């Protein structure tokens, strides 16, 4: 359940990172057994990236990918995947191209607290049309809704089984609100271009994130509402949800207009009230999925596989999604393990 504010409420008035790449299978590799080949890219900025899955020196045709999301430091991450049956001879790899790379990089395949978060990304495409807008919603480490301006439906779409229950009134409202979020970010891109005296031909990125945390008693803990321009902090709500943090003089002008209009009070009402109310509904409707704990199957490199949630403690490689709701991790040098699903 997204924020529902009027158009003029969140309108603005006034560092490239190279991707980390991981290639792996969802399950342990077994000849003749259907599996999924994954290429997890993360920690990169800007969002434009070209990812290919290679089989025996040629591109794999039907490759799907996850919806664009980003981490607390505003860097993006994506999962590229495809179904495959590995055999003895076949060799697989991932090729990644990005503005930070002088040439495409190839990586071979070596064979009870809760939260609700919404992530919004809008990237300007001068001349090539309206900005590319992608919105995703999370409950804990599970994506459940999405919106892509380039997709055909022009609707908010389900990405979890427990959200498909919701009726047309729900989807109409979320579709209406996410389109308003997009309209806000499009205007903000044009506004921010002028405030920084930037050329109309350059591509720029606007990012918005907000959500709420609850404890094991499902009572409100903390709320967030943050905003970034080109991967850098612009304006954010402080932990108390009544005052703002601005980065530079352009964001300080926005801060004053929002303080006079009492924008923080409207966001506080959503984050402390509406956000927790629908998070509780989601945790109930998806209890079989969201309230489960999956213990890590364990097997100097320490392995941990097929666990949920992603929080875990073990060269340390980033925790990665398996593509089926579970996660993976390994660490290289006794090995210490800590997870919520294991006594």
């Amino acid at each position, epitope marked *: 359940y997204m924020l529902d504010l009027q158009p003029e409420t969140t309108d603005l008035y006034c560092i490239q990172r190279t991707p980390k790449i991981q290639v792996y299978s969802r399950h342990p590799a077994e000849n003749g057994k259907s599996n999924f080949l994954n290429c997890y890219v993360s920690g990169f900025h800007p969002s434009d990236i070209e990812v290919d899955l*290679l089989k*025996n*020196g*040629e591109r794999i045709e039907k490759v799907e990918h996850s919806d664009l999301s980003f981490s607390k430091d505003w860097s993006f991450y994506l999962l590229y995947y495809t179904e495959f049956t590995p055999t003895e001879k076949d060799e697989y790899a991932c090729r990644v191209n990005h503005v*930070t790379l002088s040439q495409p990089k190839i990586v071979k395949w070596d064979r009870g607290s809760h939260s609700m978060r919404y992530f919004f990304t809008s990237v300007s495409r001068p001349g090539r049309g309206e900005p590319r807008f992608i919105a995703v919603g999370y409950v804990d480490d599970t994506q459940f809704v999405r919106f892509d301006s380039d997709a055909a439906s022009q609707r908010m779409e389900p990405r979890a089984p427990w959200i498909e229950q919701e009726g047309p009134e729900y989807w109409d409202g979320e579709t209406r609100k996410v389109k308003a979020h997009s309209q806000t970010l499009r205007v903000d891109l044009g506004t921010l271009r002028g405030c920084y005296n930037q050329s109309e031909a350059g591509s720029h990125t606007v990012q918005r994130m907000y959500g709420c945390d609850v404890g094991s008693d499902w009572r409100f803990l903390r709320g967030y509402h943050q905003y970034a321009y080109d991967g850098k902090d612009y304006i954010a709500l402080k932990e108390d949800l009544r005052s703002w943090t601005a980065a530079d003089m352009a964001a300080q002008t926005t801060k004053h207009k929002w303080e006079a209009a009492h924008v923080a009070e409207q966001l506080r009402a959503y984050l402390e009230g509406t956000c927790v109310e629908w998070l509780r509904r989601y945790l109930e409707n998806g209890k079989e999925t969201l309230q489960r704990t999956d213990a890590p199957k364990t097997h100097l490199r320490c392995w941990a596989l097929s666990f949920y949630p992603a929080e875990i403690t073990l060269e340390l490689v980033e925790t990665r999604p398996a593509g089926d709701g579970t996660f993976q991790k390994w660490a290289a040098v006794t090995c210490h393990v800590q997870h919520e699903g294991l006594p």
Partner: nanobody
Amino acid sequence: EVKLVESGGGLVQPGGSLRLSCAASGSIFSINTMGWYRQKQRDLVADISSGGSTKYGDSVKGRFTISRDNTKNTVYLQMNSLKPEDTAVYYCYGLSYSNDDYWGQGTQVTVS
């Protein structure tokens, strides 16, 4: 191990054409996909597998055509309707059947 011999670049007037060629050395069982990128980063122009599966960059679709002579492990890039924005160094590349990439020195292409 693998050597990529490039040829076919140079100067051309707007609307003119050019045919790049890239020949791979070594055994024919050593290179699968062959193609071109063009110049910080380099962008995909066109490539083709041994079986003939082609892929084109968005900014050259319709104008550029890649083809292959499997009997000689050599690919050709027919560049039609060239524009000043096509001016770049075009780098030939090849992928082994174990996903090892090989890169040529590149050929400058300039459009008046």
